[PDB]
Amino acid sequence: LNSRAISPWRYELDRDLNRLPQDLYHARCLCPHCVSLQTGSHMDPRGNSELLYHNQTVFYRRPCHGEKGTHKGYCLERRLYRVSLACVCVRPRVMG
Amino acid sequence: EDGPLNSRAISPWRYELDRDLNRLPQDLYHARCLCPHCVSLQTGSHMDPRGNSELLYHNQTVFYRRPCHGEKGTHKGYCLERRLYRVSLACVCVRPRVMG
Amino acid sequence: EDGPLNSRAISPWRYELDRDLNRLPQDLYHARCLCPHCVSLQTGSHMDPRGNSELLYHNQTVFYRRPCHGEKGTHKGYCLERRLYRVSLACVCVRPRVMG
Amino acid sequence: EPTVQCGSETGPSPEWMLQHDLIPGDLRDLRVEPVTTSVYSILMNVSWVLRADASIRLLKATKICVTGKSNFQSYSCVRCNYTEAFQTQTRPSGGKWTFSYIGFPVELNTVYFIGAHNIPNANMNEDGPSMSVNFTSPGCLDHIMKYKKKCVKAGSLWDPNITACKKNEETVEVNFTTTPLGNRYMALIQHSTIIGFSQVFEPHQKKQTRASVVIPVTGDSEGATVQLTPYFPTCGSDCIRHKGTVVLC
Amino acid sequence: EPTVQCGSETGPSPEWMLQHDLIPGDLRDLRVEPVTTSVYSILMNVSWVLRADASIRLLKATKICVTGKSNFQSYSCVRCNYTEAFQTQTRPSGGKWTFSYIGFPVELNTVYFIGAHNIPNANMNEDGPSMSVNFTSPGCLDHIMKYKKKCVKAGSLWDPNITACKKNEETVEVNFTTTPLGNRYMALIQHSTIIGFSQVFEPHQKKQTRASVVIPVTGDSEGATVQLTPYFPTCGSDCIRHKGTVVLCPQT
């Protein structure tokens, strides 16, 4: 996979104590241009890399807003999040 | 080639419709790229055979219908059947696997 | 250069750690200097090979304890064991030897 | 002599609904080993070192789990307790305590991110207990493992037997045995750029003789490189390929 | 509200004569800061972060030690007890526990090291609980420590007033102002190689004006640097040296 794409990307740790799963990963491909298909090491500048995203499901817990007083409590509140998936090779936008 | 990158990627890729009476959303599109290999970079029209295009999937939750299992008799009923669906997002240019 | 004499020595020596659970002091920061040849005194960074570097030593009263020899049975115990421990102190570089 | 018995459990932990006054320690270490089962699948053992510095006074469960991240996106978790209440800071025989587990399925070129933490965890706003190990799994380019049916269908053991030779300055001839696993063969000749190209269509043959294809070439083709891409209905675009040679007849 | 009170004590720990069934835990982090006192000394405030993971149920002392390896090598470190027992993980106010202590003497041109461990300590055949924090103190080449008396005797704040110019191709003239605090001086000049050397033999003079030195040179002396060092009986061979710059005295 990421060791084979024209614009390879890696995955960086981003821990939280209140996110399910406890770990999520946001890829940032290191390449500002798409690599050459003939060498794999020479830098081919005729391309660019742009991040691809989606939106995913995550869960959080908040303590009870109502002043119950029995315990801290918990709630299954649901907002959304932004996480990438990969990088694509893009033909630029030129003027002239 | 200009547009929302759906025509500007080296791996161009169209859409196909998937209809269904009980999916929310009723609209899901499957990426169906059209090239057998990656396009050329210096001409934009001629054909570059050293690359390949592959689907990349993901899971996005949707809603489905079955009638109420209990024989209530009031009406047919409905339920929020919540499972996933596997779709395609973008074909990418990849260096192939070759043995020798 | 300015500093605590280990940044101004010709053969600067660092200070590395060792651990024990029954020794005093729990750490004995020994010296292991990388400099294999007296560095130039006009630079402080250049590599001058005209000298050979070697360590200097002493024997330091230290403390060990192994459990009690006798089978008293009241508790594990220990012994107040004095044996001398081998420690390097500081690096000097020296003129090499001539054969012929 | 405590032991650990585990079953799969993924989802919210009922422990998150209660804030515990006292919490256990971290984990000293964690390491994961790959093994090969007898025939012929692959399962995984996990290894970790429970804390030695007396952190043990209270602990019940340690859930270890991973997100599998390939072209497919996978994730599941395993929750289990330790069956006996600890009393010693090491084995009464000696050494830090150890436990292990088996049962995680493993796929092709799938990188797993396995992390652990004790149960229960801390409340809101304390230090993170994160401890995880990254890993690398091999593909189907290893000489050990051609024996999966999935890769065999990709013609892993298939020998193209490519024999490519130059007829004259403009025509090149290739000979090779056909195969009942495919129907379409192409050819790339690459020295610096594309020198020549052709396409071949042939359904199958019982005799299975060496083929012969005429492919035009431009310029000097001496010392070029021959490559074959076979098409199967299964592998499609990710079909494995093989080298080819250039000789003069 | 438990507090901290330290009293100096070095030697064998009584608690090291007994093996404990349960031992106290590690420490999160240890920070130490360099401070300056009012008058004119330099002291250090140490700080550590204590556990929250149930290790607070039993821990009575936290031994903290400092070592230095300079011309001296010293080891005397204070044990500190905790006044009150604990029943909870954090203060009713909340937050991570942080403690401090002042009083370790500090000197010049020294690399120190700080240890860390708690009392009681671990039994035999167990994990090493120690963490490291390294540090460094400054010397007497800074403005704030220009008033440190020891290096004041060494001439921390003296003004050399060095002015040297080339008398001719074979002689260079040097001018500077002396002080009763010095009685013997040296003299070197270096441009690319050693191009001149001398020493200055003059105890003192009553009216105390600028000097004048005649020095021979081997070749061209333009663009060189003048270097002179005092011989003070206190600073010995550790005596500071001041830069110099030579100019041209025109015949006109």
Author numbering:
A (entry chain E): 82 to 177
B (entry chain G), C (entry chain H): 78 to 177
D (entry chain I): 19 to 57, 62 to 271
E (entry chain L): 19 to 57, 62 to 274
What text comes from the article?
The IL-17 family of cystine-knot cytokines consists of six members: IL-17A–F, which exhibit differential binding specificities to five receptors, IL-17RA–E. The most well-studied IL-17 cytokines, IL-17A and IL-17F, are produced by T helper 17 (TH17) cells and are elevated in the context of inflammation. Thus, IL-17RA serves as an organizing hub mediating IL-17 family signalling at the membrane by acting either as a direct receptor for IL-17 ligands or as a co-receptor.
During 2D classification of the IL-25–IL-17RB dataset, we observed classes of higher-order IL-25–IL-17RB structures. Further classification and refinement revealed arrayed trimers of 2:2 IL-25–IL-17RB modules. We refined these particles to produce a map with a global resolution of 4.39 Å. The higher-order IL-25–IL-17RB complex consists of a core IL-25–IL-17RB homodimer flanked by a homodimer on each side. These IL-25–IL-17RB homodimers are connected by interactions between the membrane-distal tips of the IL-17RB type III fibronectin D1 domains. The physiological relevance of this higher-order trimer of homodimers is not clear, but given that IL-17RB alone is not able to support signalling, we speculate that this is not a signalling active assembly. Reduced IL-17RB dimerization of the L40A;R46E mutant could be explained by these residues contributing to the formation of the higher-order IL-25–IL-17RB arrays.
